Amino acid sequence: APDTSVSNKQNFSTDVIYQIFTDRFSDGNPANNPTGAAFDGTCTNLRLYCGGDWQGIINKINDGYLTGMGVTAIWISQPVENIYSIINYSGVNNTAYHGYWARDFKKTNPAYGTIADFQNLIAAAHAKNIKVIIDFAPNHTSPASSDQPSFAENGRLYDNGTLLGGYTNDTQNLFHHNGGTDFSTTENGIYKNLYDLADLNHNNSTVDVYLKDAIKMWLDLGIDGIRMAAVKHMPFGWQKSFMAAVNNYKPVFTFGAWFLGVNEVSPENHKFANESGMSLLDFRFAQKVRQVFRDNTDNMYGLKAMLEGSAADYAQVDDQVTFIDNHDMERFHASNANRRKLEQALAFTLTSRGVPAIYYGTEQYMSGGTDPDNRARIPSFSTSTTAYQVIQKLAPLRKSNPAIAYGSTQERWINNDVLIYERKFGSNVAVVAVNRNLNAPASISGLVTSLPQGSYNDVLGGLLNGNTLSVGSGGAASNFTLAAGGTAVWQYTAATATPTIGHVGPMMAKPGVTITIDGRGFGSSKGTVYFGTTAVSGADITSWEDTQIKVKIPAVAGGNYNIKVANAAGTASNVYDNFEVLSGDQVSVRFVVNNATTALGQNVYLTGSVSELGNWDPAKAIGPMYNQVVYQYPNWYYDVSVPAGKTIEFKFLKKQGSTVTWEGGSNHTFTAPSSGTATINVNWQP
Numbered sequence: 001a002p003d004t005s006v007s008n009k010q011n012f013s014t015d016v017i018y019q020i021f022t023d024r025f026s027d028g029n030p031a032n033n034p035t036g037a038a039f040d041g042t043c044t045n046l047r048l049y050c051g052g053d054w055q056g057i058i059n060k061i062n063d064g065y066l067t068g069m070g071v072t073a074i075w076i077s078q079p080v081e082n083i084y085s086i087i088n089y090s091g092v093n094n095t096a097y098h099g100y101w102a103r104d105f106k107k108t109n110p111a112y113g114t115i116a117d118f119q120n121l122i123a124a125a126h127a128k129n130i131k132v133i134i135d136f137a138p139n140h141t142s143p144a145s146s147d148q149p150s151f152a153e154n155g156r157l158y159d160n161g162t163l164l165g166g167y168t169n170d171t172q173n174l175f176h177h178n179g180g181t182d183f184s185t186t187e188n189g190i191y192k193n194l195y196d197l198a199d200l201n202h203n204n205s206t207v208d209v210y211l212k213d214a215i216k217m218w219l220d221l222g223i224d225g226i227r228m229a230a231v232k233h234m235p236f237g238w239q240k241s242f243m244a245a246v247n248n249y250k251p252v253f254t255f256g257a258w259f260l261g262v263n264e265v266s267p268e269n270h271k272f273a274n275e276s277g278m279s280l281l282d283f284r285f286a287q288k289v290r291q292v293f294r295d296n297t298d299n300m301y302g303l304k305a306m307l308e309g310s311a312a313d314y315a316q317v318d319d320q321v322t323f324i325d326n327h328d329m330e331r332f333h334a335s336n337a338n339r340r341k342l343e344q345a346l347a348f349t350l351t352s353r354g355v356p357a358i359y360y361g362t363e364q365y366m367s368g369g370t371d372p373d374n375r376a377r378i379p380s381f382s383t384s385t386t387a388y389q390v391i392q393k394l395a396p397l398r399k400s401n402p403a404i405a406y407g408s409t410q411e412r413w414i415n416n417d418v419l420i421y422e423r424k425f426g427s428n429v430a431v432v433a434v435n436r437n438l439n440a441p442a443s444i445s446g447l448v449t450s451l452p453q454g455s456y457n458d459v460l461g462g463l464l465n466g467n468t469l470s471v472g473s474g475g476a477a478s479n480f481t482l483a484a485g486g487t488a489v490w491q492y493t494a495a496t497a498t499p500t501i502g503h504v505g506p507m508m509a510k511p512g513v514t515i516t517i518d519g520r521g522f523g524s525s526k527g528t529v530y531f532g533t534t535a536v537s538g539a540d541i542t543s544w545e546d547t548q549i550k551v552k553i554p555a556v557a558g559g560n561y562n563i564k565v566a567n568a569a570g571t572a573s574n575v576y577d578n579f580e581v582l583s584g585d586q587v588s589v590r591f592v593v594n595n596a597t598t599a600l601g602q603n604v605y606l607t608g609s610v611s612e613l614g615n616w617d618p619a620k621a622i623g624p625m626y627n628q629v630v631y632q633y634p635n636w637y638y639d640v641s642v643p644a645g646k647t648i649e650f651k652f653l654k655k656q657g658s659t660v661t662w663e664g665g666s667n668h669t670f671t672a673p674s675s676g677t678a679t680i681n682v683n684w685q686p
């Protein structure tokens with residue numbers, strides 16, 4: 001199958017995601033609607049259930065709404081069973097219409113539908129070449145109060161109907177009991193509750209094994225991807241172990257929700273996206289887009305900086321899920337604003353690197369403040385809006401033009417209000433021009449592109465006041481006027497002679513696992529795949545065609561490898577770096593080091609005898625470790641994903657910048673559990 005196939009669960013870069021807030025999309029089955037105080041058919045009380053369900057989605061898939069838009073993937077509310085409690089938050093009734101208050105990760109939310117309904121959804125979607133992504137929030141169960149168990153459902157957790165435990169009398173310690181987070185520190189945000197939500201304790205073997213078993217059920221149900229909620233609030237080490245569980249079973253494209261504010265650039269965020277085993281929702285991208293196109297708080301130079309910076313900060317920038325708004329921020333379109341702002345932001349996003357996601361209703365110019373005013377029922381299913389047609393014209397390009405899906409990004413023309421950027425992949429090119437200035441046209445002269453000589457029609461057909469482009473030799477464009485609020489797209493595709501890797505996924509797995517290598521110019525006959533210097537050919541290459549390769553990871557030592565391929569003739573491709581071969585199945589282990597005193601600015605890290613521990617290289621050490629919540633300084637702790645059943649040697653380090661102080665004495669030793677969790681407690685050796 002080709003890289004663009006709906007069967008490709010490892011690569012969403014050629015897709016366009018449509019984010020669906022299930023309850024607010026389409027009530028296809030009134031029979032499953034909640035009743036009484038938990039319900040409002042009119043959807044006037046946005047904190048109640050409105051009736052939107054999976055049948056509705058199926059209907060909207062079958063009637064051409066999504067497909068007509070060029071949508072090729074959907075991201076839906078967390079499908080798992082939520083609490084049925086109607087929570088009164090100071091005079092206002094609230095329901096789990098949003099799906100984020102889980103009670104049983106192995107059952108469905110009856111308001112959305114049954115397991116049978118879910119299967120029907122998967123089938124209907126797939127039949128229409130639409131991939132299905134589910135929100136998954138293993139961070140917590142639901143709102144709770146230990147002192148008052150009668151509040152809500154006391155964050156109770158069930159296992160396919162079997163009560164595991166609740167927030168009150170949590171003898172098992174399934175949850176954390178460290179109060180609520182104040183978002184002051186990462187550690188604080190991880191080991192304390194989000195709001196009043198019962199924080200799951202992933203160091204608890206039951207919880208760990210349960211959640212990993214739960215996701216398997218959904219993977220078995222045929223999901224094509226996962227949107228991990230509140231990833232900044234779960235141990236990064238545990239999440240890597242979760243991603244390993246997924247990847248070592250049935251790998252599916254996964255991205256986490258890690259909020260970033262205006263002008264916020266987080267190295268931690270980058271590191272997470274770079275080493276966790278999942279990508280992220282591109283908040284950096286979205287916030288900048290809003291500043292430039294919506295709020296006018298930065299100009300095209302800021303947009304360009306974000307593009308160049310992000311391309312350098314993210315190992316796999318093409319896996320980042322972009323967007324212009326969502327269920328947690330005001331809707332992009334301000335009721336009083338000019339619609340061209342939203343249309344341009346849309347066009348920009350659809351043609352930019354990464355994986356574009358469109359919040360349901362954006363195409364209908366929905367306006368709304370913060371939660372829940374931004375979660376109103378989609379008021380129309382009209383295909384006649386300008387925004388609908390924009391998506392309709394550009395979405396398909398991600399499929400037909402690999403430059404848009406995998407291409408680099410380069411600024412070709414720029415001023416305060418104008419940005420003309422180029423996407424390039426192999427023999428494929430796309431040039432996009434955007435003039436944010438709604439009042440002033442710009443004179444474009446001196447534009448140089450990689451487009452071959454010729455005349456290029458605006459892919460938008462002038463919908464956004466675009467124009468035709470005339471390119472001479474050397475890729476020089478004839479002078480032209482970029483209309484006020486003008487947005488244009490010119491593109492060119494052609495066969496690529498040299499094997500060119502555009503994408504690889506998953507990016508972290510143990511040997512034997514099958515990975516997907518997408519691009520162009522691979523040729524029809526099997527070639528060779530390289531994991532570092534190790535060459536793989538023949539049988540272990542399950543399938544090989546021009547745009548996609550399926551190959552099993554060879555049994556090489558755990559570590560980070562550069563992936564490369566060569567066609568049957570021996571011609572090598574570019575290198576796709578950062579591939580992590582695990583040392584085997586993973587388990588999440590908590591490392592605790594006692595009496596490790598330090599100086600302000602200097603932190604304790606963990607290093608060990610396996611790649612998961614950085615193989616004794618302090619530059620690849622795990623940390624910095626935590627010392628505030630679960631354990632207090634001078635005791636440090638951290639949750640780490642390590643190879644199950646392996647006997648591992650380790651030591652702790654103190655680091656100040658790049659300067660490192662090693663523990664004295666002999667290495668510590670322990671053997672990782674074969675499944676579940678473990679806590680290794682040792683003293684700092686001077």
Ligand SMILES: OC[C@H]1O[C@H](O[C@H]2[C@H](O)[C@@H](O)[C@@H](O[C@H]3[C@H](O)[C@@H](O)[C@@H](O[C@H]4[C@H](O)[C@@H](O)[C@@H](O[C@H]5[C@H](O)[C@@H](O)[C@@H](O[C@H]6[C@H](O)[C@@H](O)[C@@H](O[C@H]7[C@H](O)[C@@H](O)[C@H](O)O[C@@H]7CO)O[C@@H]6CO)O[C@@H]5CO)O[C@@H]4CO)O[C@@H]3CO)O[C@@H]2CO)[C@H](O)[C@@H](O)[C@@H]1O
Nearest residue numbers: 089098100145146147148179180193195196229230257371
């Ligand atoms: O020994 C003393 C005492 O200890 C214990 O009590 C402590 C609690 O254990 C502890 O959790 C802590 O809770 C307090 C919070 O720290 C504090 O913030 C406050 O919480 C308020 C909150 O401040 C309010 O804003 C309000 O929250 C609203 C949100 O503002 C809304 O936006 C909305 O939200 C929900 C969204 O609608 C959902 O979509 C979803 O969000 C998801 C995102 O959409 C998604 O993108 C992302 O991926 O994931 C998100 C999460 O899944 O969920 C959101 C959260 O539900 O709705 C909420 C809720 O109305 O209300 C809360 C609660 O009033 O107050 C908390 C209570 O004090 O501090 C306690 C005291 O120290 C014991 O429990 C107790 O018995 C003991 O007496």
Ligand SMILES: OC[C@H]1O[C@H](O[C@H]2[C@H](O)[C@@H](O)[C@@H](O[C@H]3[C@H](O)[C@@H](O)[C@@H](O[C@H]4[C@H](O)[C@@H](O)[C@@H](O)O[C@@H]4CO)O[C@@H]3CO)O[C@@H]2CO)[C@H](O)[C@@H](O)[C@@H]1O
Nearest residue numbers: 184185186597598599600601602603604626627628633634
């Ligand atoms: O934003 C969160 C913080 O995260 C990082 O802070 C780290 C420090 O870099 C570590 O050095 C360590 O801090 C220890 C400190 O090393 C230790 O000496 C002790 O600090 C005393 C200190 O001796 C005394 O002079 C006075 O300042 O009181 C301090 C508090 O007792 O204890 C510290 C831990 O409490 O750990 C923290 C993480 O907790 C980051 O570098 C910081 O910017 C940031 O604040």
Ligand SMILES: OC[C@H]1O[C@H](O[C@H]2[C@H](O)[C@@H](O)[C@@H](O[C@H]3[C@H](O)[C@@H](O)[C@@H](O[C@H]4[C@H](O)[C@@H](O)[C@@H](O)O[C@@H]4CO)O[C@@H]3CO)O[C@@H]2CO)[C@H](O)[C@@H](O)[C@@H]1O
Nearest residue numbers: 607609615616617649650651661662663664665666667668
């Ligand atoms: O592959 C080569 C070798 O790899 C393995 O060695 C590991 C060790 O097992 C780790 O302990 C670590 O070594 C640290 C050491 O723990 C630390 O004390 C420090 O050693 C200093 C020492 O304190 C000081 O007294 C003096 O002797 O200098 C030493 C440094 O040379 O620093 C060590 C790291 O530099 O890391 C190494 C790998 O680097 C394996 O055990 C070996 O068999 C193998 O040869």
Ligand SMILES: OC[C@H]1O[C@H](O[C@H]2[C@H](O)[C@@H](O)[C@@H](O[C@H]3[C@H](O)[C@@H](O)[C@@H](O)O[C@@H]3CO)O[C@@H]2CO)[C@H](O)[C@@H](O)[C@@H]1O
Nearest residue numbers: 411412413414415416418420443444445446447448449
């Ligand atoms: O080798 C020629 C020339 O190439 C490169 O310049 C290009 C700029 O990088 C690119 O921004 C664009 O420049 C336009 C400005 O963006 C715009 O504001 C206005 O000033 O017109 C410019 C074009 O006339 O195009 C040029 C190429 O024409 C390279 O950066 C230069 O060093 C080099 O001289």
Ligand SMILES: [Ca+2]
Nearest residue numbers: 029033051053
């Ligand atoms: Ca319904």
Ligand SMILES: [Ca+2]
Nearest residue numbers: 190199233234
């Ligand atoms: Ca947590």
Ligand SMILES: [Ca+2]
Nearest residue numbers: 315316577578
């Ligand atoms: Ca890379």
